[PDB]
Amino acid sequence: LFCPICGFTCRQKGNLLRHINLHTGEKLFKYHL
Amino acid sequence: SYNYVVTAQKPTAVNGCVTGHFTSAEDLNLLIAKNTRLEIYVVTAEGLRPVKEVGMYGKIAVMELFRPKGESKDLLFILTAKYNACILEYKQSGESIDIITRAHGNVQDRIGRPSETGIIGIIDPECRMIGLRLYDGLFKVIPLDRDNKELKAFNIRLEELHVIDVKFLYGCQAPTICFVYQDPQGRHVKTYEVSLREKEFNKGPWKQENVEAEASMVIAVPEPFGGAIIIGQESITYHNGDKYLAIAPPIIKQSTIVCHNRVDPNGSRYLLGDMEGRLFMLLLEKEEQMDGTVTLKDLRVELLGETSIAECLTYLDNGVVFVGSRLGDSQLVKLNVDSNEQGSYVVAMETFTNLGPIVDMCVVDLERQGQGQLVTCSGAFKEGSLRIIRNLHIRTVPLYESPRKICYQEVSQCFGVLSSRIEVQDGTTALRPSASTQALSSSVSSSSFGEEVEVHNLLIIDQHTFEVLHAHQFLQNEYALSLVSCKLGKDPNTYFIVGTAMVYPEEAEPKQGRIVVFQYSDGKLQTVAEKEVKGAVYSMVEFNGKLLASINSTVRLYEWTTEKELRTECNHYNNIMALYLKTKGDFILVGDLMRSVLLLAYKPMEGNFEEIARDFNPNWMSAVEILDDDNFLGAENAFNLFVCQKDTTDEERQHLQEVGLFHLGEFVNVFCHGSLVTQGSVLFGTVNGMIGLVTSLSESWYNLLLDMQNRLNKVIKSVGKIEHSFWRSFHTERKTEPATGFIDGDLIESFLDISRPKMQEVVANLQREATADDLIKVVEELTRIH
Amino acid sequence: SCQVIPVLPQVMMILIPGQTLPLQLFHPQEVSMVRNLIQKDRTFAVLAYSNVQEREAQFGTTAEIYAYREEQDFGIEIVKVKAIGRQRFKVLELRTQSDGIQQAKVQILPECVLPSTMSAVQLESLNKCQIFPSKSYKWWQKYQKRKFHCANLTSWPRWLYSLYDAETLMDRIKKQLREWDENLKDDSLPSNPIDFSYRVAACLPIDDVLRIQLLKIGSAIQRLRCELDIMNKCTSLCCKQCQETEITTKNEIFSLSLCGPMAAYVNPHGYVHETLTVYKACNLNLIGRPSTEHSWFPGYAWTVAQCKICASHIGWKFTATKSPQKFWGLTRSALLPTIP
Ligand SMILES: Nc1cccc2c1C(=O)N([C@H]1CCC(=O)NC1=O)C2=O
Ligand SMILES: [Zn+2]
Ligand SMILES: [Zn+2]
């Protein structure tokens, strides 16, 4: 489980969603992932 | 916006002088070219006798004389700083004198950058072509046939971009050009042959040569010698094909040689002047080859003497020399066959007043009759002085050091003058006696080998005798910027307040500075208060009993506490450097060098500044001033005046639109309120020495005078046929806009000179229909102000 | 003067002319856009978004593609490009095609080039000496004494006119840049004020709004003065979100390899990070374990770093097995300069 932006790593999901939501960007996933 | 501009004192700096038979083939003439003014004098035994004095619509820039074959007298070629070339002839019909215009044109290349070395103009000694260097890599040529009535020119593409100096060579079968150019290898002298039939260069008579690394002046020696002479600071070298003669005398090492002249027609003697005013004679010694030609044997240089800082040198017959100067009075020196006991051969016959440069000025009614006199800080280096101007009568007070600012204390009956003198580092040693070193009483502030430092002084000068009452020397490596005289707070004494910045060469922007407060009473100048600040105090104003200071990029307000110590009240970090600070009522005008005007207002109840308007238009300024609550007036680059007007939406209420432009044609150092004899009268000084005056007209008169101008421009004939609207168009070196909201005062005042027959056609159908008498009365009313 | 240019939407960064922008492209729309633009004029335009809503752009730069490549791995049309900013333009109107194609009508701004300060008051007699051999402290002290010799005629001193001169102002920036790279050859930088100012602006740690300010200053001298202002007065960097937690000071800024102190890099998923390399960092907690994977700097493993107050991602700590042993790379977006 990797953060697509910064490379943050986790073993579960909730931390991953929180970390991604913490990012202050446009999060254009559809144009990046 | 409506405004009126009148020149109360014609420019007096000398741009350049020429000698020749202009007025008549039988008498000698000397032509001086002050900024926009051309003065033709007839040389006589007693001295110059003025014969004509015309005013061109342009800065003279390049002036030369030439007598093409088939003419009796010498024609005069003038190329102005705006690139208006014109060939003129002098025509004296009976007792009436008038300069005819043989030809005129505008030799300007659309795409190009003006040469960083400056405009250069030269004429073939045989008068076959005129060579002009205006733009890097391009040499413009104007054939001098009788068919070029418009001065048609063609460009020859030079390969050596950086050309230091260039001349035509005497003695050749085709026009030859010799010039010193710099490339990465060094400085090289190179020669080309100009071909009109092919319109291009050809290999010169002798190849390029390497020269002194600074070789920066070229002199074309006439027959029988031929060839060229190259001058730097270190060596003087004569090149003529194979012949090469270099002499490196120690006497010229100290100062750069900046101007030159030919004394004898055969080139046996030359006059050279250097920056610090010394005058040398360069001698050429000749040998006659048996059954050959004359050749040069050796070069000698000897120091004739010391004159005013020489801008142009010309040799009037019978051993007279007219030393023109932009920094000091011009003069007529006399060259004797033997030196006076002091060891100098040069004595002074006559002196011509030169008010410029005017670095600061102030209006003061010394005698209290209600018509104030004017005091200006004129000149630089040893020429510095104070000029007292009254109704135009001028009086001089030399200082022998550069004055920078001035202010007037009515109660103390004295002038405060900031001054600067250069001292060598060999402790430091003074160069010559000065006003600051010869003061009746002196004080010193407390708190390499050949390098030249600047020592700064504050001088208290009595207003009647003009003797230096006191001289206060500032700290080492301190530069004084601002000088304001005022009484702060409820304090009843009057103070000389000085702003200074600590400048160390290793640094770039000064970090430390001081605001000092002096009190002049009982013949002593004692320091009352002193404030340390973290910056340079560029400008200072008396803001309603407080001290407004410009600490680097900051406007700070100091109140005067009862304990006599400046105390901060408010600050406003305004991004730009507040170099120019002006006040009126509650409004403060702040500006830096690159335009960027910014109008603030001091909110009394709150106690802090609030920005009211701003206008950022990158362009160099010289000075700014406030005409009234809503109109501000400044000087932009390329010798221009401009007016901004504070005003709907907020954006419209925070934009100082320009509502007037004008190409004054001079550098305006300082503006100051006051008149020497339309609401308001802002005088302004200039670098050339011209003093001008601006007033605020009413709409009706402004329309009337604009129409009268537009009418005059169709009657009055200008020298060289230069359209007035062209000379008054705004200018920024690649752009022009028509002048608006400015009535050229000289053109209007010239209405009086023209006679009745022209008067009638000027006044026809104007605006009851006006008549010549009514316009004469109106123009008299306008003339009254200056 | 006026033109119409297309805009790729995924690129969110204020590009400065002369700066090299690398990108990865994934979604079909931009793939078609780039394949259509490559054959045509390479006039990629990047808008400086004043509002983070992606619908308010006033100034931008016409980027130019100079490198193109395709990698059809992963079964899909990944394409990698490298462009460079060329000119600055003003947003006249946003005529979106409604397909996501943000077509912008704009105008190309000029560069107001002023003449030398002492070109009006110049003494014509000594004007020949204005040319002088080019070649240090004594040399600069002579340059100032020769070029502004006519400052006597005006009310300001030479050192005040030396604060607005292009060359003397270039030299100070050169010194303060060499203090950062320690291998910056004099000839690497450009030689004229426009290019020099644009290149310097691309290496400072300016966050977002002090770039749109620099990007909208037309006069080259103004840009040089503002850049030197930023470089001198501001010496500390803090977390953008916290705005009050210091991470580093300018003196720790350390360039690596051939690129300047700060350089643009692309992560595996196409995001763009303007990484700034530093010797030391503080207030950061590390997560993960040193793993090489797609390490930007060869031979160095990385661990993710985030400030210990708001946990926002700030950068990575790079280490290697062997010079320097440990250093840090901080993304420029997360950093906010502050006056000490
Ligand atoms: N393997 C992943 C996986 C997800 C996100 C990232 C990386 C990764 O390597 N980087 C950075 C950090 C490490 C580095 O220097 N290069 C990168 O692309 C990421 O953002
Ligand atoms: Zn992340
Ligand atoms: Zn944080």
Residue numbers in the entry:
A (entry chain C): 17 to 49
B (entry chain A): 2 to 392, 710 to 744, 748 to 768, 781 to 980, 984 to 1013, 1024 to 1113, 1122 to 1140
C (entry chain B): 77 to 211, 220 to 406, 410 to 427
Quote the paper.
Thalidomide and its analogs pomalidomide and lenalidomide (IMiDs, immunomodulatory drugs) are molecular glues that bind cereblon (CRBN), the substrate receptor of the CRL4CRBN E3 ubiquitin ligase, altering its substrate specificity to recognize protein neosubstrates that are ubiquitinated and subsequently degraded. IMiD-bound CRBN recognizes a small β-turn motif often found in zinc-finger (ZF) transcription factors. In this study, we developed a phage-assisted continuous evolution system (PACE) to reprogram molecular glue complexes and applied the system to evolve a small, 36-residue ZF domain that engages IMiD-bound human CRBN. Finally, we obtained cryo-electron microscopy (cryo-EM) structures of the evolved zinc finger in complex with CRBN and bumped as well as canonical IMiD derivatives revealing an expanded interface of evolved interactions bridging the CRBN N-terminal and C-terminal domains.
To understand how they influence the affinity of SD40 to CRBN, we determined cryo-EM structures of SD40 in complex with DDB1ΔBPB•CRBN bound to PT-179 or to pomalidomide. The structure of the CRBN•pomalidomide•SD40 interface is similar to that of CRBN•PT-179•SD40, with the SD40 C-terminal tail adopting the same looped conformation, indicating that the binding mode of SD40 is not specific to PT-179. In IKZF1, Q146 (equivalent to Q18 in SD0) forms a water-mediated hydrogen bond with the phthalimide amino group of pomalidomide. As SD40 evolved to bind PT-179 and PK-1016, both of which lack this amino group, this hydrogen bonding opportunity was lost. Given this molecule-agnostic mode of binding, we hypothesized that the reversion mutation F18Q in SD40 would restore the water-mediated hydrogen bonding interaction seen with pomalidomide.
